[PDB]
Amino acid sequence: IQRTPKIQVYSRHPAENGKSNFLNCYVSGFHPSDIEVDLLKNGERIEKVEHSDLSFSKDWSFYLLYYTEFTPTEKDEYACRVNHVTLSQPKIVKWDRDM
Amino acid sequence: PEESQFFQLFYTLLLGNVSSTELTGMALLADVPIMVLDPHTWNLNICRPWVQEITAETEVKKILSFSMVGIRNTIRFMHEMTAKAGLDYPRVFQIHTGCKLYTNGTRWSFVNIGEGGRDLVTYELSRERWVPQRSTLLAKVMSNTLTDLRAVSGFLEHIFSSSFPNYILMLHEEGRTDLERRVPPMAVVFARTAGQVQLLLVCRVTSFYPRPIAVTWLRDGREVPPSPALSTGTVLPNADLTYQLRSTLLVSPQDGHGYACRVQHCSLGDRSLLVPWHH
Ligand SMILES: CCCCCCCCCCCCCCCC(=O)O
Numbered sequence: 294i295q296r297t298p299k300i301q302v303y304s305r306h307p308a309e310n311g312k313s314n315f316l317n318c319y320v321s322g323f324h325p326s327d328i329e330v331d332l333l334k335n336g337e338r339i340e341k342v343e344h345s346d347l348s349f350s351k352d353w354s355f356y357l358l359y360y361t362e363f364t365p366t367e368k369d370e371y372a373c374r375v376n377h378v379t380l381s382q383p384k385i386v387k388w389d390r391d392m
Numbered sequence: 393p394e395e396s397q398f399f400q401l402f403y404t405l406l407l408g409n410v411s412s413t414e415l416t417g418m419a420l421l422a423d424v425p426i427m428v429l430d431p432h433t434w435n436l437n438i439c440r441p442w443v444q445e446i447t448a449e450t451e452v453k454k455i456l457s458f459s460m461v462g463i464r465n466t467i468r469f470m471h472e473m474t475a476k477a478g479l480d481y482p483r484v485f486q487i488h489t490g491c492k493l494y495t496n497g498t499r500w501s502f503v504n505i506g507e508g509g510r511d512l513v514t515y516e517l518s519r520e521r522w523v524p525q526r527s528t529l530l531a532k533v534m535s536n537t538l539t540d541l542r543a544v545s546g547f548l549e550h551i552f553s554s555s556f557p558n559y560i561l562m563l564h565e566e567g568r569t570d571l572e573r574r575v576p577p578m579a580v581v582f583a584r585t586a587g588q589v590q591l592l593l594v595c596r597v598t599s600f601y602p603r604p605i606a607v608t609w610l611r612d613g614r615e616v617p618p619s620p621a622l623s624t625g626t627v628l629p630n631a632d633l634t635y636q637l638r639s640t641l642l643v644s645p646q647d648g649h650g651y652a653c654r655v656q657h658c659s660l661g662d663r664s665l666l667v668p669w670h671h
């Protein structure tokens with residue numbers, strides 16, 4: 294069966310403008326495993342983005358964590374863009390600073 | 393406790409076309425990655441500096457790669473079953489294995505195979521048998537070939553009775569720097585808009601290790617029982633092997649109750665983390 298990814302975007306620590314943090318995009322619950330994830334700053338792909346090793350949960354569905362060191366600022370918007378065979382177009386999830 | 397003596401293996405064999413396999417695989421003790429299969433080379437990368445010159449000795453790394461039930465044979469066994477079932481590429485196969493050691497003597501061991509993200513066959517250790525999980529041909533063929541392979545059944549017995557238990561024990565002794573690390577949570581409480589003229593109270597708990605945790609809401613200092621009003625989220629990973637969770641409670645504004653988030657975590661001992669909602 295195909296399963297579309299859940300996409301959760303959050304920072305490592307509660308955010309404070311001007312202090313370094315990590316931005317995380319956790320994509321989970323998807324099948325099959327091919328997936329493309331970019332982290333965006335003001336709409337543009339961030340270059341230095343790491344990710345965990347693909348693994349899977351008890352229900353066979355896959356999960357991956359993508360992440361990057363960042364310094365939040367009042368003027369900048371961050372987001373996670375995901376493409377997967379279950380999506381007709383890439384799904385963009387903006388970072389909610391509460392997260 | 394005994395999450396620390398739980399060894400698991402996760403393998404994904406993505407069979408693109410006839411000439412193509414893409415592999416991923418990981419070995420875990422608790423939530424600590426011990427070994428990761430390199431997709432390009434198919435060698436087992438060792439993930440921790442305390443993992444390397446230990447086994448080695450039990451040649452778990454030889455078992456997983458070159459042996460009868462090793463990846464090289466498994467890949468060919470999976471290509472073969474696709475073929476002997478008349479099925480077409482791409483096919484994705486997955487293998488989940490585990491060995492837990494309880495400190496009363498008993499072991500829990502399992503081998504599960506899936507195809508296309510659903511169960512396909514399972515290995516019954518006590519019955520010396522592979523059991524079908526779905527009711528079609530690929531399930532019947534794989535289950536019959538495996539059970540008939542009496543040498544494989546014998547090989548798996550040794551693996552789960554001797555090889556994996558000795559390995560856990562040695563890893564447990566060497567790996568406490570990761571397996572006994574404790575990092576307490578920190579928590580923040582704030583309020584946000586919600587529908588039906590309600591407020592959403594949010595308790596965001598961050599930075600903690602190990603994974604198990606319990607986050608409850610208190611209304612005047614008594615625990616809020618679970619209802620549609622209360623949602624505790626799923627635990628989320630950080631890159632640094634710590635975790636994060638959000639719990640939320642719908643409340644009416646100006647209701648005359650005081651609220652607080654309480655966090656119980658083993659790194660805190662007998663003291664909770666208690667975080668009031670202040671307006
Ligand atoms: C480490 C746990 C082992 C479980 C692996 C899943 C079982 C697959 C067994 C396939 C290997 C059999 C030998 C290959 C025979 C062949 O290529 O036809």
Ligand SMILES: *[C@@H]1O[C@H](CO)[C@@H](O)[C@H](O)[C@H]1NC(C)=O
Nearest residue numbers: 407408409410411412413414
């Ligand atoms: C098999 O798949 C790979 C890429 O996924 C491709 O490059 C290769 O040419 C394919 N082989 C054929 C023609 O079956």
Ligand SMILES: *[C@@H]1O[C@H](CO)[C@@H](O)[C@H](O)[C@H]1NC(C)=O
Nearest residue numbers: 346428429430431436437438
């Ligand atoms: C394994 O190790 C090599 C370094 O020798 C590295 O280039 C590669 O990315 C590693 N892969 C994984 C997934 O562990």
Ligand SMILES: *[C@@H]1O[C@H](CO)[C@@H](O)[C@H](O)[C@H]1NC(C)=O
Nearest residue numbers: 493494495496497498499500
């Ligand atoms: C031993 O531990 C296992 C798992 O915790 C349990 O199933 C079994 O009943 C225990 N035996 C006794 C009586 O201690």
